[PDB]
């Protein structure tokens, strides 16, 4: 609110039509922070057009990488938030931070699993078990990487075998399906298959289809 007797403030601060961002303890912030126009890049001294330390800079249509965080900047030099389309792919950036999404995420009551802003396709572990995040158009015109209805059915993907119960979640552990015993690994829900596996200090032989030989 107030200023200082070098200048200090709190929050987003305009000085001679340059943008700066202060933390509530009056210290200047370097990074991507939210202002009234969106998230901006408050850059270290001398990153573009001889910008002063902590000044928001021109930075257009390109990614930005700070620490282990990824951002995407549009034409107006603000970081995309939410769903954005970069070279034909849909990425997602957290609205609160502008940082790329990672892990399990619900968005408009739809479930996705993100790596570096990108929805991954495959079988991953959400809070309610392993779901099938599927290619686009697999079931009920779903979007790329969206968890889909998948009931009482096997799935082959990336040379692995999964079985999905009535709740569209992948089963884990010892299972009996149509008279056959499988063991789906708790870590990945992948069937043990095509040879010999140690399960709980015991070797078993599993066929290529993942069915345990008695």
């Amino acid at each position: 609110y107030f200023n200082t007797n070098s200048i200090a403030s709190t929050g987003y601060t305009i000085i001679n039509d340059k943008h700066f961002y202060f933390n509530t303890d009056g210290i200047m912030q370097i990074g991507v922070f939210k202002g009234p126009d969106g998230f901006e890049y408050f850059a270290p001294a001398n990153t573009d057009a001889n910008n002063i330390e902590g000044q928001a800079i021109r930075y257009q249509n390109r990614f930005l990488y700070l620490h282990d965080n990824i951002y995407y900047f549009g034409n107006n030099s603000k970081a995309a938030t939410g769903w954005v389309t970069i070279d034909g792919r849909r990425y997602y950036f957290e609205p609160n931070t502008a940082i790329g999404a990672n892990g399990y995420k619900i968005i408009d009551n739809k479930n996705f699993y993100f790596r570096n802003g990108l929805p991954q396709i495959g079988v991953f572990k959400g809070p309610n078990g392993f779901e099938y995040f599927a290619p686009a158009n697999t079931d009920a015109n779903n979007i790329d990487g969206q968890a889909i209805r998948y009931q009482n059915r096997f799935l082959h993907l990336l040379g692995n075998i999964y079985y999905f119960g009535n709740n569209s979640k992948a089963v884990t552990g010892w299972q009996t399906i149509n008279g056959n015993m499988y063991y789906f690994m708790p870590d990945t829900a992948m069937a043990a298959a095509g040879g010999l596996f140690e399960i709980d200090g015991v070797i078993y032989f599993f066929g290529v289809d993942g069915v345990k030989a008695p």
Partner: nanobody
Amino acid sequence: VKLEESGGGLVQAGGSLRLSCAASERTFSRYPVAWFRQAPGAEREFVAVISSTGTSTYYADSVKGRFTISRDNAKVTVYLQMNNLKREDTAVYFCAVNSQRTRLQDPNEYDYWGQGTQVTVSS
């Protein structure tokens, strides 16, 4: 990191050798260990594997009843007891550790190996 084999060499048929696979770290006890064997330049073929616990074992049909695999976790060592030795058992013998506990009959799946010990059977 790190397997040392010993107990091979020359031996008349019908005879017996005991192979050893000594490990460097005590973390060896966590994983199943196996013996493989290759004839010159040809395949590394599956011989036997034993569970991490030592409780459970699986053998190739060609050595079943003649070979016994076992481990002393206190000594961090895996043994292959070879009895009834045929001439056909002539080969280099390798022991190998498998971290993923997966597809144990497949050499490729293994992470660590010993140097190999030569076994030669006479007549």
